[PDB]
């Protein structure tokens, strides 16, 4: 409607809405970057910024309608309520500016309340980085245009924009809404686990995801986008689940979880109905649920004794590692034991024993009985060397 310039209204409310936002106190606070991004993409220079306008105005429309249902009818006539507010007339000057500042004051915390929902873990940079691929912005504007998938609720105040990934220095996510897809797939996991017994749980979880609207959006991609999406969701899944105090620790956990995925995609003999969807986001959750203890053991090894990382950087070049079988816990085990082999008593006779006692429980867990569920011959051969 041409009763009010709504795009200029939103552009005016940007700074006051971002100034209400607080991160979790050490997250390299992003308010200037949110302002720069949102003022660069609340224009209509493109058809991309025009899409962000249409859906940002639609989210404002639905949140203002949900606010106005609980509003009484006297406060719902905003102009008549504003002509009787003598102090607002008197602080704004004329009457137009009073009405306009009233719409500013209504729209600003609603706009802050949606920036706090579509910015966290650095989601707005994927919308604003140059030459980010088309599947990224298509998935961004799909999840953002969907009301019941991404539920925004309502709250001169402070809105906490809560970070889930707790990422590295400007290590913002790579899938558009990683936390929402992770929570969505855990909801489908608990539902499919309640429904189906633990024999067709993988089939049921993959097919439940393929029948859902985000799954049928992601199935419309071609394959080269689906592989990039699966790799980025492995990275964002590990940042949402575990904490990497390195970027090489992240790449080894990403190699590990990718080989776990490829091991579970080869556990069944020849189904050929569910391996029609092998590049699907439930396989990351399946791989982590089936190899959780080994992945957490491997990250504990990389945490206690970090100098194994460089040794793994040799062993990957020795192996072309992370194929179709999870072995990085075993090779981290073998490399730690070979370092304790070569270092006989060298920092001291006491600090060597301290390193042995620190690596006792992960190495004793690796070469134990209830650790390796079912692997190939070469993983067990590396476990024999570790024994």
């Amino acid at each position: 409607s041409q009763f009010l310039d709504t795009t200029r209204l939103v552009q005016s409310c940007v700074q006051g809405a971002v100034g209400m936002l607080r991160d979790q106190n050490e997250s390299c606070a992003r308010n200037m970057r949110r302002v720069t991004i949102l003022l660069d993409l609340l224009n209509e220079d493109n058809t991309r910024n025009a899409s962000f306008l249409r859906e940002s105005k639609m989210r404002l429309h639905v949140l203002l309608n949900k606010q106005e249902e609980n509003q009484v009818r006297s406060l719902k006539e905003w102009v008549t309520r504003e002509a009787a507010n003598q102090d607002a007339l008197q602080e704004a000057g004329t009457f137009r500016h009073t009405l306009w500042k009233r719409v500013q004051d209504v729209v600003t915390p609603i706009l802050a309340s949606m920036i706090a929902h579509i910015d966290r873990d650095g989601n707005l940079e994927l919308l604003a980085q140059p030459d980010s691929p088309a599947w990224v912005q298509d998935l961004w504007m799909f999840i953002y245009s969907d009301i019941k998938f991404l539920n925004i609720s309502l709250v001169m105040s402070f809105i906490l924009v809560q970070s889930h990934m707790n990422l590295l220095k400007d290590a913002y996510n790579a899938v558009p809404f990683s936390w929402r897809i992770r929570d969505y797939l855990e909801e489908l996991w608990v539902q499919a686990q309640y429904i189906t017994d633990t024999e067709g749980l993988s089939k049921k979880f993959v097919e439940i995801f393929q029948k859902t609207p985000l799954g049928v959006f992601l199935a419309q991609f071609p394959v080269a986008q689906q592989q990039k999406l699966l790799q980025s969701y492995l990275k964002d899944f590990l940042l949402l689940t575990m904490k990497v105090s390195s970027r090489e620790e992240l790449m080894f956990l990403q190699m590990a979880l990718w080989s776990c995925l490829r091991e579970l995609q080869e556990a069944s003999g020849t189904p050929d109905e569910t391996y029609k969807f092998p590049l699907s986001l439930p396989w990351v959750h399946l791989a982590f649920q089936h190899f959780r203890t080994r992945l957490q053991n491997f990250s504990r090894i990389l945490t206690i004794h970090p100098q194994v990382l460089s040794s793994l950087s040799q062993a990957a070049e020795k192996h072309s590692l992370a194929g179709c079988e999870m072995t990085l816990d075993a090779f981290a085990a073998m490399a730690c034991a070979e370092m304790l082999k070569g270092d006989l008593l060298k920092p001291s006779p006491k600090a060597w024993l301290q390193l042995v006692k620190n690596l006792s429980t992960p190495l004793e867990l690796v070469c134990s009985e209830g650790y390796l569920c079912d692997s190939g011959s070469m993983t067990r051969s590396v476990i024999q060397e570790v024994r």
């Binding site: 552009q11 005016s12 940007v14 700074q15 006051g16 971002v18 100034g19 209400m20 607080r22 991160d23 606070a29 308010n31 200037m32 302002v35 720069t36 003022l39 008197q90 602080e91 704004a92 000057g93 609720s153 709250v155 001169m156 105040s157 402070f158 906490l160 809560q162 707790n166 929570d183 909801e187 608990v190 539902q191 499919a192 686990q193 309640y194 429904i195 689940t241 575990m242 904490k243 959780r292 203890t293 957490q296 053991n297 504990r300 945490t303 206690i304 301290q354 006692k357 620190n358 006792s360 429980t361 992960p362």
Partner: protein, 420 residues
Amino acid sequence: LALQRDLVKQFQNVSRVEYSSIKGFIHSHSSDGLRKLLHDRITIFLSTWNALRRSLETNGEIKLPKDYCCSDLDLDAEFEVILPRRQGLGLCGTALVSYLISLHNNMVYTVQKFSNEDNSYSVDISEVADLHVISYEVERDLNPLILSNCQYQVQQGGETSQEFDLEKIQRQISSRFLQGKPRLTLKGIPTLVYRRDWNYEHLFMDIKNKMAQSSLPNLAISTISGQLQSYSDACEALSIIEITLGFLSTAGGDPGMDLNVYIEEVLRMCDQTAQVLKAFSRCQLRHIIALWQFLSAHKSEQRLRLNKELFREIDVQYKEELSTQHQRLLGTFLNEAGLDAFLLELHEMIVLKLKGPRAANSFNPNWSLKDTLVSYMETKDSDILSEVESQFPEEILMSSCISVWKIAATRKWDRQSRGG
């Protein structure tokens, strides 16, 4: 912790939770599997509470009132006891998690103090799992471990002695269950912030930390007070400065060269008027806290000299008139006085520390105005305290703070109006 992370993820609100009991919350879920998982986690929570709800009253560091730790919590209890807040009735979950972390950490500390002598292995509480916590059982873990170490011995003369080797039991417990565990930092404790707007004192502390902040020049005061003699301009200027101090809380900048040219017209501000910016022209970014308090005191004294009610949010607890000899001592203070700093700082103390109801829990209207004023100025150790505030009448109460500011501001306006 999975329970509390799910609840913080779901209920990051204030005063909104429409649930009477825990059964009112479990049964309000459409999907059945999520309801079962929620019921299992709440059952674990309540059993662990009912186990520890007396060691928390004594040994826990979160001192919580005795109404909480006296009854046995079941599913008919209040919904608030499963939410992790830090004020009331939701201190139960926080105190439980803190006590379990303390148990785990004191055990790990005793193990390291004994033999390991140092260990930097320390994971955060936002990512604990089953292998980071001290986890054993008593039937299948401790009782065979003890029975394998009760050694029997028969002498030639004839008897049968039992004996524990306590060092072997210490070694096997400390080897199976206690070694290789991290030290759980309290970093990502799941919590609800329970609060809308925390006041400007911590925000001004944040700006004073990230940036250098000096007072305004005496030329800049004249420039600002000249450009926005209108009331609407002073209101607009105060609005802009409040938005910018919200941004400079979470960031900083060069204290020189105010963010007009390089941000406030190229980063699409695009809206503000001319004489407000002409007031802000002779300012830099080390002049933001001083500019805020100048514009706030300026807006209030323009409310004064145009005969409007001028505090209106401070309660009547601090708004009563001076009597005669009180205001004679006030007048002989105001004869030799730096009014332009005194009423500026006094208006700062009024609008920050006095905000209507429930302010007399910390700002008793029976103290002396001198002592609470110099305390408020020595919290941030101002050079403004160095002036005539030591010559203030020590017998003026805080029940008449507003009228002291009105008398000082009316004297300032009568001087600068009757003089020029």
